[PDB]
Design a protein around this motif. Structure first.
Motif, short mmCIF file in Angstrom:
data_model
loop_
_atom_site.label_atom_id
_atom_site.label_comp_id
_atom_site.label_asym_id
_atom_site.label_seq_id
_atom_site.Cartn_x
_atom_site.Cartn_y
_atom_site.Cartn_z
N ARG A 25 -23.04 0.32 -18.26
CA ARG A 25 -23.34 1.46 -17.05
C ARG A 25 -22.38 2.50 -17.39
N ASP A 52 -30.22 -2.37 -24.45
CA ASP A 52 -29.52 -0.99 -24.54
C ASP A 52 -30.52 -0.08 -25.27
N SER A 54 -26.55 1.03 -21.40
CA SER A 54 -26.85 0.21 -20.20
C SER A 54 -26.06 -0.95 -19.94
#
Ligand SMILES: COc1ncccc1CC(=O)N1CCC[C@@H](C(N)=O)C1
Ligand SMILES: [Zn+2]
Length: 139
Positions: A63, A103, A60
């Motif tokens: 992305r 994450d 994350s």
């Protein structure tokens, strides 16, 4: 953040489990950083039942998904956080790659299905809590 939804179960990092997760607790293991809670809706994620050492994880903080080679599940020393003192976390797999605290929960997948979720990181290594041994998630 992130979770795995399989059957009537929700698999999350134990350190990120919510009040609802703890009120509907099925199983938790502090040594693995895992917690499984019950759900009312049916989940349709597929759990991998294999010995793959290559896969792809979602990061994350970038992305992006990255392909990685990762170690077999083992007892690895992990430094202290506000959730745990310094200890050995079991069933952990390491790979060379980027991660940040947020994450945790990112899924690692191989061609067979979900392998585990991001659970640790630091020094350019990312660690994944394995879920492939939890055969009861499917029955
Ligand atoms: C993905 O996590 C990270 N990545 C980079 C730097 C730092 C981290 C955080 C980290 O390692 N943690 C988060 C709190 C729970 C800890 C545990 N499982 O014992 C592990
Ligand atoms: Zn596999």
């Amino acid at each position: 953040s992130g979770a795995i939804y399989v059957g009537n179960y929700r698999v999350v990092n134990r350190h990120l489990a919510t009040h609802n997760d703890w009120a509907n607790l099925v199983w938790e293991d502090s040594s693995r950083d895992l917690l499984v809670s019950s759900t009312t809706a049916q989940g349709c994620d597929t759990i991998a039942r294999c010995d793959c050492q290559t896969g792809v994880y979602y990061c994350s903080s970038r992305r992006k998904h990255y392909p990685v080679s990762f170690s077999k599940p083992s007892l690895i020393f992990v430094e202290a956080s506000e959730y745990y003192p310094a200890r050995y976390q079991s069933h952990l797999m390491l790979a060379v790659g980027h991660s940040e605290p947020g994450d945790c929960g990112g899924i690692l997948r191989c061609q067979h299905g979900v392998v585990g979720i991001v659970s640790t990181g630091g020094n350019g290594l990312v660690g994944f809590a394995d879920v492939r041994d939890l055969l009861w998630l499917d029955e």
